[PDB]
Design a protein around this motif. Structure first.
Motif, PDB file in Angstrom:
ATOM      1  N   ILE A 201      -0.862   8.344  -0.269  1.00  0.00           N
ATOM      2  CA  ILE A 201      -0.125   7.341   0.492  1.00  0.00           C
ATOM      3  C   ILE A 201      -0.558   5.954   0.030  1.00  0.00           C
ATOM      4  O   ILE A 201      -1.754   5.681  -0.099  1.00  0.00           O
TER       5      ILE A 201
ATOM      6  N   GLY B 210       2.934   2.162   2.309  1.00  0.00           N
ATOM      7  CA  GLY B 210       2.760   3.483   2.878  1.00  0.00           C
ATOM      8  C   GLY B 210       3.986   4.356   2.722  1.00  0.00           C
ATOM      9  O   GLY B 210       4.964   4.207   3.456  1.00  0.00           O
ATOM     10  N   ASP B 211       3.921   5.291   1.775  1.00  0.00           N
ATOM     11  CA  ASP B 211       5.015   6.192   1.450  1.00  0.00           C
ATOM     12  C   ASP B 211       4.434   7.529   1.019  1.00  0.00           C
ATOM     13  O   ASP B 211       3.442   7.569   0.285  1.00  0.00           O
ATOM     14  N   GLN B 212       5.050   8.611   1.479  1.00  0.00           N
ATOM     15  CA  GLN B 212       4.698   9.935   0.994  1.00  0.00           C
ATOM     16  C   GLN B 212       5.526  10.270  -0.241  1.00  0.00           C
ATOM     17  O   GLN B 212       6.722  10.560  -0.155  1.00  0.00           O
TER      18      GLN B 212
ATOM     19  N   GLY C 164       6.842   1.887  -3.590  1.00  0.00           N
ATOM     20  CA  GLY C 164       6.031   1.639  -2.414  1.00  0.00           C
ATOM     21  C   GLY C 164       6.593   0.663  -1.400  1.00  0.00           C
ATOM     22  O   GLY C 164       7.244  -0.322  -1.758  1.00  0.00           O
TER      23      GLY C 164
ATOM     24  N   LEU D 214      -1.006   1.698  -0.083  1.00  0.00           N
ATOM     25  CA  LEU D 214      -1.649   0.769   0.846  1.00  0.00           C
ATOM     26  C   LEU D 214      -1.442  -0.710   0.539  1.00  0.00           C
ATOM     27  O   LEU D 214      -1.958  -1.543   1.293  1.00  0.00           O
TER      28      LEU D 214
ATOM     29  N   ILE E  59      -3.846  10.713   7.471  1.00  0.00           N
ATOM     30  CA  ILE E  59      -2.472  10.263   7.680  1.00  0.00           C
ATOM     31  C   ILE E  59      -2.342   9.556   9.026  1.00  0.00           C
ATOM     32  O   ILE E  59      -1.389   8.803   9.261  1.00  0.00           O
TER      33      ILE E  59
ATOM     34  N   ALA F  24      -3.765  12.408   0.812  1.00  0.00           N
ATOM     35  CA  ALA F  24      -3.291  12.835   2.126  1.00  0.00           C
ATOM     36  C   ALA F  24      -3.724  14.257   2.454  1.00  0.00           C
ATOM     37  O   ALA F  24      -2.992  15.220   2.201  1.00  0.00           O
TER      38      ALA F  24
ATOM     39  N   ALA G 218      -4.578   3.431  -2.584  1.00  0.00           N
ATOM     40  CA  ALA G 218      -4.149   4.762  -2.167  1.00  0.00           C
ATOM     41  C   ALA G 218      -5.338   5.574  -1.675  1.00  0.00           C
ATOM     42  O   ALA G 218      -6.491   5.146  -1.759  1.00  0.00           O
TER      43      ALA G 218
ATOM     44  N   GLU H 214      -3.219   4.752   9.119  1.00  0.00           N
ATOM     45  CA  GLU H 214      -2.038   4.164   9.741  1.00  0.00           C
ATOM     46  C   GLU H 214      -2.408   3.444  11.032  1.00  0.00           C
ATOM     47  O   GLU H 214      -1.688   2.553  11.492  1.00  0.00           O
TER      48      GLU H 214
END
Length: 50
Positions: free
Chosen positions: A4, A16-18, A13, A6, A44, A39, A36, A48
């Motif tokens: 993920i 924050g992206d999966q 990006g 940052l 997770i 995860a 990063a 966040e």
RNA sequence: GAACUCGCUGUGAAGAUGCAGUGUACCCGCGGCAAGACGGAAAGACCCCGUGAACCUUUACUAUAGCUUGACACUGAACAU
């Protein structure tokens, strides 16, 4: 794998992206330089909240 | 191995000091010649055999170090096709 983002990353990006990333672009650029974290479903919620 | 350790012809595991026939020779040393046995330079050279051993050669067989080929992993991102 499942890291993920940052930071103010380029066009994959949004702070924050999966994503589905390769292992070689994961470590030595996105693992421990910043930006990063892997995860493992414990981080997770942890970053966040940050 | 032991000997009271002669020469011929013949026989015989096929070239006899020992067998058979026959001839010759008092008993015992010594110095020599090497013809036979007996050894030596040992034929440790010639041949065969063992379902023996050893190295060596090769397009023998089966493996293998090395060299070499590709895949995967270490190993990524931006573009263009």
């Amino acid at each position: 794998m499942q890291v993920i983002l940052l930071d103010k990353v380029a066009n994959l990006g949004s702070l924050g992206d999966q994503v589905n990333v390769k292992a070689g672009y994961a470590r030595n650029f996105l693992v421990p330089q910043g930006k990063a974290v892997p995860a493992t479903k414990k981080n997770i919620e942890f970053f966040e909240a940050r």
